[PDB]
Amino acid sequence: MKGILGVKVGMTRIFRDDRAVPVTVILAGPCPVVQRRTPEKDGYTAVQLGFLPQNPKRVNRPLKGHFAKAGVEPVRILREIRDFNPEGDTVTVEIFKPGERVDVTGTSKGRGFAGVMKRWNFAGGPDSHGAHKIHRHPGSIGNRKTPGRVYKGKKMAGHYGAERVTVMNLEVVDVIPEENLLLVKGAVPGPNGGLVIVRETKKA
Amino acid sequence: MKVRASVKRICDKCKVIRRHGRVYVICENPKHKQRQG
Amino acid sequence: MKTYVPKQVEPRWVLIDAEGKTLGRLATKIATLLRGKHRPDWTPNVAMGDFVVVVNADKIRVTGKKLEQKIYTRYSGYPGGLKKIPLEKMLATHPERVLEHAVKGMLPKGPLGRRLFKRLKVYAGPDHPHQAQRPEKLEV
Amino acid sequence: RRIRPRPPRLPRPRPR
Amino acid sequence: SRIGRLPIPVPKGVSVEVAPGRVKVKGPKGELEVPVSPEMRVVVEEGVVRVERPSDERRHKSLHGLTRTLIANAVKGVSEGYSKELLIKGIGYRARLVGRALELTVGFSHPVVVEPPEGITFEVPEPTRVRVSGIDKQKVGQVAANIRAIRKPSAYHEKGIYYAGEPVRLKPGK
RNA sequence: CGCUGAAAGCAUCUAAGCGGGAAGCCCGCCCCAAGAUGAGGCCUCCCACGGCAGCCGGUAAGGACCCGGGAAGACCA
RNA sequence: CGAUGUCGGCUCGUCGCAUCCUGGGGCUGAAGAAGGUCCCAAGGGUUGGGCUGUUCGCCCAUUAAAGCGGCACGCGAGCUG
Numbered sequence: 001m002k003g004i005l006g007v008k009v010g011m012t013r014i015f016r017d018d019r020a021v022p023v024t025v026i027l028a029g030p031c032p033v034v035q036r037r038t039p040e041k042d043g044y045t046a047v048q049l050g051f052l053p054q055n056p057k058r059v060n061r062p063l064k065g066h067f068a069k070a071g072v073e074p075v076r077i078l079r080e081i082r083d084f085n086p087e088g089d090t091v092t093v094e095i096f097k098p099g100e101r102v103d104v105t106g107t108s109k110g111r112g113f114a115g116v117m118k119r120w121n122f123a124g125g126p127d128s129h130g131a132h133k134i135h136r137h138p139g140s141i142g143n144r145k146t147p148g149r150v151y152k153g154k155k156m157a158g159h160y161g162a163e164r165v166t167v168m169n170l171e172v173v174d175v176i177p178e179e180n181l182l183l184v185k186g187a188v189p190g191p192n193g194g195l196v197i198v199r200e201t202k203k204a
Numbered sequence: 205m206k207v208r209a210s211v212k213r214i215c216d217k218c219k220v221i222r223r224h225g226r227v228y229v230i231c232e233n234p235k236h237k238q239r240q241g
Numbered sequence: 242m243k244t245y246v247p248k249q250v251e252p253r254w255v256l257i258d259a260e261g262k263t264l265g266r267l268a269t270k271i272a273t274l275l276r277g278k279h280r281p282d283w284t285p286n287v288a289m290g291d292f293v294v295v296v297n298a299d300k301i302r303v304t305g306k307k308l309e310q311k312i313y314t315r316y317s318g319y320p321g322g323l324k325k326i327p328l329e330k331m332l333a334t335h336p337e338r339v340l341e342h343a344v345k346g347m348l349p350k351g352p353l354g355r356r357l358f359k360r361l362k363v364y365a366g367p368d369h370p371h372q373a374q375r376p377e378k379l380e381v
Numbered sequence: 382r383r384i385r386p387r388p389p390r391l392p393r394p395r396p397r
Numbered sequence: 398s399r400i401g402r403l404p405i406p407v408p409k410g411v412s413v414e415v416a417p418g419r420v421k422v423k424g425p426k427g428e429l430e431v432p433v434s435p436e437m438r439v440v441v442e443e444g445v446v447r448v449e450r451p452s453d454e455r456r457h458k459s460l461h462g463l464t465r466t467l468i469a470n471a472v473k474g475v476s477e478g479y480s481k482e483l484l485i486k487g488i489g490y491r492a493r494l495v496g497r498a499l500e501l502t503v504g505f506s507h508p509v510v511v512e513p514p515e516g517i518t519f520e521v522p523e524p525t526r527v528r529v530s531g532i533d534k535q536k537v538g539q540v541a542a543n544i545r546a547i548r549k550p551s552a553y554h555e556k557g558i559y560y561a562g563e564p565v566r567l568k569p570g571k
Numbered sequence: 572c573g574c575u576g577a578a579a580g581c582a583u584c585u586a587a588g589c590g591g592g593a594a595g596c597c598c599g600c601c602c603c604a605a606g607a608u609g610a611g612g613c614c615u616c617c618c619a620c621g622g623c624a625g626c627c628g629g630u631a632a633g634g635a636c637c638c639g640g641g642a643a644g645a646c647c648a
Numbered sequence: 649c650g651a652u653g654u655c656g657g658c659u660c661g662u663c664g665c666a667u668c669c670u671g672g673g674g675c676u677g678a679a680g681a682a683g684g685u686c687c688c689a690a691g692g693g694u695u696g697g698g699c700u701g702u703u704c705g706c707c708c709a710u711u712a713a714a715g716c717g718g719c720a721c722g723c724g725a726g727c728u729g
């Protein structure tokens with residue numbers, strides 16, 4: 001089950017067969033495997049992947065030990081791809097070909113303390129006809145004496161976004177090995193310059 | 205299948221079966237098939 | 242003359258083979274062993290029962306049609322969050338829990354009853370990792 | 382849905 | 398008025414080895430094991446198997462008759478063998494043998510493929526008749542049923558898949 | 572809805588056994604999660620310093636404070 | 649009764665199933681298509697508008713369907729009045 005780490009760079013649209021396709025560019029390769037997890041040693045199967053070069057000054061001592069055991073230059077982020085064993089010591093964009101269908105994980109844009117209307121799409125209150133300082137309020141949150149409490153899970157205001165979101169089954173439009181570029185069709189979670197993970201889709 | 209609390213034989217060809225905790229009635233006559241409930 | 246109060250004594254480890262035993266009938270005896278009520282210097286306000294290793298929990302036995310009809314029950318606090326798990330399935334997914342849940346319910350509730358449940362160590366399969374305590378193999 | 386209208390049992394509260 | 402007591406004639410050369418809660422039967426066509434309640438006793442005599450029951454309570458009376466027939470169907474199984482025939486009725490409706498497999502064309506958009514499970518052999522003599530043959534009784538009947546279900550007798554026409562010897566009962570339309 | 576099948580010489584989906592069968596159930600998908608006090612696992616770094624399962628002082632790996640900020644954000648994080 | 653705010657609407661739902669639809673079935677006076685009738689099933693879904701304070705109902709135009717009920721006839725320290 002192949003995967004790769006990357007950065008969201010920006011969107012555009014290209015032309016393919018008199019059709020405009022919205023795309024998102026992701027800079028994916030190259031990612032050196034710096035640990036492998038096995039059923040003996042760890043209980044399961046994964047490949048720990050590294051991404052983006054780091055100023056070795058900024059990498060502390062417990063971390064320096066970890067890279068050296070891999071034969072690997074210091075790296076900004078570590079992330080695993082589960083149930084994955086590439087034969088090489090380095091994973092690149094060459095593992096996805098145009099037409100392939102992928103899933104991408106990103107960290108969503110953060111809307112901070114979000115109101116009930118933005119977060120959960122409540123209807124708010126009326127805007128005239130006597131509506132009184134409730135125009136964006138949630139309304140009732142319960143019943144009366146029975147049950148006489150509020151359910152767990154009840155949708156209310158609170159922080160929104162800045163959370164892990166996966167969007168699935170996106171079409172791979174192109175790959176440009178010469179630039180470690182990956183062109184996926186559609187929209188990817190997070191802001192430009194954001195970290196993402198690209199896996200083979202779990203969709204049939 | 206008829207479902208009712210009173211299951212009786214309808215014709216002389218009906219047979220009373222008890223099957224998996226339930227009283228049934230089977231027969232060659234497709235109407236007459238019954239189960240209690 | 243005031244009643245005897247023991248000084249803290251060393252708890253005996255004990256081994257039980259659950260294979261083929263009746264679920265609840267094994268349970269009462271493990272509970273008794275856990276309270277320590279088989280000890281003449283029993284004291285209700287201190288943990289002084291035995292430790293109990295149990296093996297072969299997966300091959301415990303139960304009477305009647307409870308295989309399909311004993312439902313274990315769990316509520317999450319969310320609306321509609323009462324899940325229902327038949328006995329069969331519990332054996333097939335976390336077998337050691339059938340014995341644990343049975344024993345748990347037979348120990349007193351409160352802080353002491355919860356620590357005695359800890360003193361019970363239940364395993365499915367023929368083996369356990371408790372060699373270091375060299376548990377005395379009891380019949381029950 | 383109760384078919385017979387039920388009387389109010391408290392007045393609309395006033396400053397009184 | 399009693400089945401379990403009736404002795405089972407065993408044609409030579411087949412063998413009946415008794416075992417705790419099972420019995421084994423080998424013959425010219427193969428072997429089979431018959432699961433048998435520890436309460437019943439299976440007895441190997443000369444060219445004969447008999448079964449006896451521990452008492453006259455209902456359950457023993459019920460396991461008795463079953464155990465004989467179960468064993469007896471195993472006996473006949475590995476010597477004479479079992480078979481059931483299926484007649485295919487209706488115009489477009491035909492059959493053919495695809496490799497070892499059974500090809501059914503009975504008026505869907507597609508043909509039907511039935512695979513022979515282990516211990517089953519399909520025979521296609523004519524386009525409109527098919528034979529299921531094997532040493533297991535309970536298995537031959539299951540398969541035939543499985544094949545029949547693919548296109549059961551119309552209630553209004555002589556059309557579909559029938560058992561050999563299945564009476565044609567139809568209702569009037571209009 | 573069956574297969575095989577007694578009791579009950581026949582019949583029976585059942586009493587022994589075996590099939591097929593739902594947008595429903597269990598899993599699978601996405602998110603949270605070891606305060607899971609039952610507090611898990613792996614990789615890697617530190618070291619057995621002084622004075623009197625303890626206290627006190629200085630340190631190690633490391634961390635915090637402070638500062639420039641940030642599609643992170645009420646403060647906090 | 650030294651106070652348990654009362655219809656309807658809005659808002660937010662959650663539950664029951666005696667199921668309106670969608671799924672699985674038996675019987676049919678089931679040719680096909682389409683219905684009738686009972687059984688299983690609460691996962692999801694179950695529209696917009698005219699009249700009236702209305703709930704309900706009637707009507708217009710659609711619909712797979714335009715389900716019925718409980719939660720102080722849910723919900724006024726949430727709004728309307």
Ligand SMILES: [Mg+2]
Pocket residue numbers: 105106107195196197
């Ligand atoms: Mg991320």
Ligand SMILES: [Mg+2]
Pocket residue numbers: 115116117118124136137
């Ligand atoms: Mg709002």
Ligand SMILES: [Mg+2]
Pocket residue numbers: 118119120121
């Ligand atoms: Mg939103």
Ligand SMILES: [Mg+2]
Pocket residue numbers: 117121
């Ligand atoms: Mg909106």
Ligand SMILES: [Mg+2]
Pocket residue numbers: 123124125
């Ligand atoms: Mg609105």
Ligand SMILES: [Mg+2]
Pocket residue numbers: 126127128129
């Ligand atoms: Mg309004």
Ligand SMILES: [Mg+2]
Pocket residue numbers: 123124125126127
């Ligand atoms: Mg608005």
Ligand SMILES: [Mg+2]
Pocket residue numbers: 130132
């Ligand atoms: Mg006002």
Ligand SMILES: [Mg+2]
Pocket residue numbers: none
């Ligand atoms: Mg005002």
Ligand SMILES: [Mg+2]
Pocket residue numbers: 131132133
């Ligand atoms: Mg205003």
Ligand SMILES: [Mg+2]
Pocket residue numbers: 144723
């Ligand atoms: Mg109220």
Ligand SMILES: [Mg+2]
Pocket residue numbers: none
């Ligand atoms: Mg209130």
Ligand SMILES: [Mg+2]
Pocket residue numbers: 147148149
């Ligand atoms: Mg309450």
Ligand SMILES: [Mg+2]
Pocket residue numbers: 110159161162
């Ligand atoms: Mg946040």
Ligand SMILES: [Mg+2]
Pocket residue numbers: 016173174
């Ligand atoms: Mg192209």
Ligand SMILES: [Mg+2]
Pocket residue numbers: 190191192
């Ligand atoms: Mg952006």
